Design a binder for this molecule. Structure first.
Ligand SMILES: Nc1ncnc2c1ncn2[C@@H]1O[C@H](CSCC[C@H](N)C(=O)O)[C@@H](O)[C@H]1O
Ligand SMILES: O=S(=O)(c1ccc2c(c1)CN[C@@H](CF)C2)N1CCSCC1
Length: 257
């Protein structure tokens, strides 16, 4: 976790959300695939509620585009204040925010409700009430009296756990830790890197725990969920760029029972 002090948000984004991994024009891309998982899961209108919490938001919002139209109270979090910062920048259309419009549009495109994308970036910005600091290794990630509405009706996390835990055991605990935040019967949308062990972010060189679809599932069950849906996307050769060594990406729709 010490390494996370050299984390460069602008380089993280550059490494992962700007072409090639960021080109949403090719259907076979990982961008389209991920946004599609989210779209379809929420489209089933089974993941509803008043509040929602996004764990380890980092400096990204794509993970919330389809969600934002289902929960009025959205809470975004992250360790690094540097990330909580970059988030704010886009939340207040401040100077030099990252441009997510291409992602916004591909959410609207995929959702097919004919929504204009400026309208989606509006609904999101509006529904995100707070950007809180968080530590998944803590038995109570947020803190004691967090401004966050608990328990949340739903959880969303992307590439967090496997990137902050040094091994499967650390990973499982971290999972159980955030699971506490989820109301019983609420939903979890977990995205992540399969069999990855490192990834760059400017100066920083972060360790990752290579995990598998079975390890991730077995661990989801172990944490107390009833695995609703679990998909795997194999990273094509053209999306390997030495910013990391990821093999594929996983999507999980879990339900705390
Ligand atoms: N102890 C901890 N608890 C929670 N998040 C942590 C953490 N230590 C580091 N992080 C954050 O976990 C993130 C991993 S990168 C993932 C960013 C974003 N979720 C995306 O979808 O791309 C970083 O933003 C990092 O700051
Ligand atoms: O699969 S991605 O290319 C992606 C997105 C983010 C990350 C990785 C990969 C791998 N390293 C993670 C840190 F360990 C961060 N994709 C980028 C476009 S939006 C959906 C996610």
């Amino acid at each position: 976790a010490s390494a996370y002090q050299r984390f460069e948000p602008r380089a993280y984004l550059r490494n992962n959300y700007a072409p090639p991994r960021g080109d949403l024009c090719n259907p076979n891309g990982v961008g389209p695939w991920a946004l599609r998982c989210l779209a379809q899961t929420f489209a089933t209108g089974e993941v509803s509620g008043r509040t929602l919490i996004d764990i380890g938001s980092g400096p990204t919002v794509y993970q919330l585009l389809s969600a934002c139209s289902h929960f009025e109270d959205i809470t975004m979090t992250d360790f690094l204040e540097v990330n909580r910062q970059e988030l704010g920048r886009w939340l207040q259309e401040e100077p030099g925010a990252f441009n997510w419009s291409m992602y916004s549009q591909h959410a609207c495109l995929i959702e097919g409700k004919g929504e204009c994308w400026q309208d989606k970036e509006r609904q999101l910005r509006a529904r995100v009430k707070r950007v809180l600091p968080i530590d998944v290794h803590q038995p109570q990630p947020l803190g004691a009296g967090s401004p966050a509405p608990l328990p949340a009706d739903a959880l969303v996390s992307a590439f967090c756990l496997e990137a902050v835990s040094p091994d499967l055991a650390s990973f499982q605990r971290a999972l159980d830790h955030i699971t506490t935040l989820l109301r019983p019967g609420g939903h979890l949308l977990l995205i992540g890197a399969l069999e990855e062990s490192w990834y760059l972010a400017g100066e920083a060189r972060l360790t990752v725990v290579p995990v598998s679809e079975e390890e991730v599932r077995e661990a989801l069950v172990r944490s107390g969920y009833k695995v609703r849906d679990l998909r795997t996307y194999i990273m094509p050769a053209h999306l390997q760029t030495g910013v990391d060594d990821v093999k594929g990406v996983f999507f999980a729709w879990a339900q705390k029972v």
